[PDB]
């Protein structure tokens, strides 16, 4: 995995040694090449993963996440060029370094073979992520959002540290391949009930699980566009990717320990989906939407059937592109009216004919319109939850109706009706913005032609 | 608010409009409409306002009892089928300032004449501001009405938006 | 119950302004100033040909445009679909399945030449 780690590091010298006025051109151009080479990770097999060395390995679950990870950094550079225009040159380069450093830790998290190496890198993404929110947010509440973001994560991560070291002492290894053959059943006792909780709580805070999600509406809403995209697209998928790997060594206790969490997630869908109906803030409507989409992923992971695992992997990729695309669309309006209120600017379809098409495509993908890969991922989860219990169809179906509302409600409120009379700085869409949306939707709709590459290791 | 002279006339208009929906046929409408005018004429010059008020209050409750549940509404009035239909084609004027220079080249006469209007607004603004400062009460405006143009050559205060409003059928 | 003397004054001043704006919305004969365009040779032979509304000329144009459409929208695609169906689709197992054709008494089997016995004699119906 050095063919992708070293090039990413070389983006740091590249940014600092480039001309003053070409920091964006070089980083944007060269980081797309790194994204292009990531397709060589698709060399998967039907029975074995890509075991590069004693440290790094890649399988059908990590591969789609790596490609999504290395594909966003170019998009996060494109989005940031506006609000960083009037900024010190050195600071404009540290910001790019934080994005480059963040990607560096991510490509090693999804490929780490040893769970303690996973934990450190999984935990190291807090620093660059925390710095982006607090230093380059636009509000007073970014300072408080970084505290909520930091301590919600650590409060759950530190117990996970004790569990992994305990497992190594009593097993002898945390290498993931070893645990596949040395895994032993988890007997039902009070000691294990606090090892199951310790292992899972760290990731369920980052999904986030309903109830422990109060940090997300603060972090995503207050962070800059570049931070919001990665926070919603790839960072939430650390939690899901963690559960998909840690659950290997938590059987057969996961069958009854999941009840408090499945019930929270199944009902939390309707709670967070309904919140989006009465949201004044456009960026906060998208943030709450993320919690409702990750509620399905938690449920799929905890019932442990191949359909749920295949669907769960597809929701993570499908939501990654959709949630990031919405944040860019919502941010484009912000850069004109400089306000996050949803009702402030209306009738923008008569003023921005093309930008209103992306809203249509972003919304239609958000509400899982078939045959998009949102529907494919969301269907397999519903199919597998029905086999778990027929009654769940009521909750899954109810959440679908509400999702169809807060998506098209967002579309109608801002893109339809009479324009606001007193807003006259609605300049046409720049070529940068239109290309930024085309880079979200087009990859997302192409995957419908070959969906098998995002259906996880259970395909 | 409304004066009792106004409230009667408005009730008279609604009674006819709902009567037209019930009657449908013009000949029948002309019949019952004449009878209604008689009912409104027999109290044309009532003296005591208290009895006059009691007539309006009783008249209203009769209208609500017989009002048409689906009264006829003109197509483009609030509640009409064509209401707000063309609002999507009513682009504002400031959107022309963003046109690419190539686009403005296709209508040289229009934009050149548009520039005359823009200078007309720009030059007369500083005067219009004073025209309202002087004529307003000390505390502030007490009503929504604007003064006309008094001195020759000055345009009425607050004219640009109501003069350049989009056409009712832009396309 | 009517315009105040100052009310009509503002309306008259605003109204006269409004007409001039609407008057200015007119387009001069020159506008729009369309730029140059590289025109196709084929249309030239038609614009000159269709200068007059000759009835016989219209038919030739009518048949010409229809023929072009029937070739680039019906003939080419069916070649592609038939080529796609014949040598890539039908060559796979259980890809195209046809309901087995119905067989009636007395029929002749084309494949093997079998003869199906007719039905038993119907005694009588008359009516």
């Amino acid at each position: 995995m050095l063919k992708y780690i070293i090039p990413t590091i070389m983006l740091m010298p590249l940014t600092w040694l480039s001309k003053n006025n070409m920091i964006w051109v070089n980083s944007t151009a060269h980081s797309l090449l790194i994204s292009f080479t990531s397709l060589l990770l698709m060399n998967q097999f039907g029975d074995n993963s890509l075991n590069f060395s004693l440290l790094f390995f890649s399988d059908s679950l990590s591969t789609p996440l790596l490609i999504l990870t290395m594909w966003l950094l170019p998009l996060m550079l494109m989005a940031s060029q506006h609000h960083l225009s009037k900024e010190n040159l050195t600071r404009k380069k540290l910001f790019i370094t934080m994005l480059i450093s963040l990607q560096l830790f991510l490509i090693m998290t999804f490929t780490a073979m040893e769970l303690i190496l996973f934990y450190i890198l999984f935990e190291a993404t807090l620093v660059p992520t925390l710095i982006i929110i607090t230093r380059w947010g636009n509000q007073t509440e970014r300072l408080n959002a970084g505290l909520y973001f930091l301590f919600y994560t650590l409060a759950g991560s530190l117990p996970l540290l004790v569990a992994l070291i305990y497992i190594q002492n009593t097993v002898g290894s945390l290498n993931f391949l070893m645990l596949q053959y040395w895994v032993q059943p988890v007997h039902n006792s009070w000691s294990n009930v606090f090892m199951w909780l310790a292992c899972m709580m760290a990731f369920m805070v980052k999904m986030p699980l309903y109830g422990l999600h109060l940090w997300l509406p603060k972090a995503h809403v207050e962070a800059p566009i570049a931070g919001s995209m990665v926070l919603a697209a790839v960072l939430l998928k650390l939690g899901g990717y963690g559960m998909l790997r840690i659950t290997l060594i938590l059987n057969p206790m996961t069958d009854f320990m999941a009840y408090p969490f499945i019930m929270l997630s199944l009902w939390g869908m309707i709670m967070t989906s309904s919140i989006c109906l009465r949201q004044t803030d456009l960026k906060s409507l998208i943030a709450y939407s993320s919690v409702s989409h990750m509620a399905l992923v938690i449920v799929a992971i905890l019932i442990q059937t191949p359909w749920s695992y295949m669907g769960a992997t597809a929701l993570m990729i499908a939501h990654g592109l959709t949630s990031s695309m919405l944040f860019c669309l919502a941010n484009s309006n912000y850069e004109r009216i400089h306000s996050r209120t949803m009702i402030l600017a209306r009738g923008l379809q008569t003023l921005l004919p093309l930008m209103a098409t992306w809203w249509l495509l972003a919304s239609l993908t958000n509400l899982a319109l078939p045959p998009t890969i949102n529907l494919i991922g969301e269907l397999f989860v519903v199919m597998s939850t029905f086999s778990w219990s027929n009654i769940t169809i009521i909750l899954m179906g109810v959440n679908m109706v509400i999702t169809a509302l807060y998506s098209l409600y967002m579309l109608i409120m801002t893109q339809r009706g009479k324009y606001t009379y007193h807003i006259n700085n609605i300049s046409p869409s720049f070529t940068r913005e239109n290309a930024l949306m085309s880079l979200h939707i087009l990859p997302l709709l192409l995957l419908t032609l070959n969906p098998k590459i995002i259906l996880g290791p259970l395909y | 608010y409304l004066t009792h002279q106004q409230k009667v006339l408005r009730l008279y208009k609604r009674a006819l409009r709902h009567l037209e929906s019930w009657c449908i046929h013009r000949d029948k409408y002309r019949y019952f409409a004449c009878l209604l005018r008689a009912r409104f004429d027999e109290h044309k010059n009532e003296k005591d306002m208290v009895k006059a008020t009691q007539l309006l209050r009783e008249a209203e409750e009769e209208f609500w009892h017989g009002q048409h549940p689906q009264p006829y509404i003109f197509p483009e009035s609030p509640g009409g089928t064509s209401y707000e239909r063309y609002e999507c084609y009513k682009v504002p004027e400031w959107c022309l300032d963003d046109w690419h220079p190539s686009e403005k080249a296709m209508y040289p006469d229009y934009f050149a004449k548009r520039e005359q209007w823009k200078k007309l607004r720009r030059e007369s603004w500083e005067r219009e501001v004073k025209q309202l400062q002087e004529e307003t009460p000390v505390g502030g405006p007490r009503t929504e009405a604007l003064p006309p143009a008094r001195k020759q050559g000055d345009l009425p205060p607050l004219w640009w938006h109501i003069v350049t409003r989009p056409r009712e059928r832009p396309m | 119950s009517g315009y105040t003397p100052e009310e009509k004054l503002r309306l008259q001043q605003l109204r006269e302004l409004r007409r001039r704006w609407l008057k200015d919305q007119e387009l001069s004969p020159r506008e729009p100033v369309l730029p140059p365009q590289r025109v196709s040779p084929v249309e030239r032979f038609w614009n000159k040909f269709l200068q007059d509304g000759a009835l016989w000329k219209n038919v030739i144009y009518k048949t010409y445009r229809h023929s072009i459409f029937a070739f680039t929208h019906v003939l080419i695609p069916v070649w592609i679909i038939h080529y796609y169906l014949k040598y890539h689709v039908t060559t796979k197992p259980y890809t195209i399945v046809e309901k087995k054709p119905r067989i009636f008494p007395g029929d002749t089997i084309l494949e093997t030449g079998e003869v199906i016995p007719p039905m038993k004699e119907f005694p009588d119906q008359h009516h």
Partner: peptide
């Protein structure tokens, strides 16, 4: 009578 249509800039 060939009035001018006010529409947003479609060039971009």
């Amino acid at each position: 009578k060939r009035l001018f249509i006010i529409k947003p800039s479609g060039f971009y």
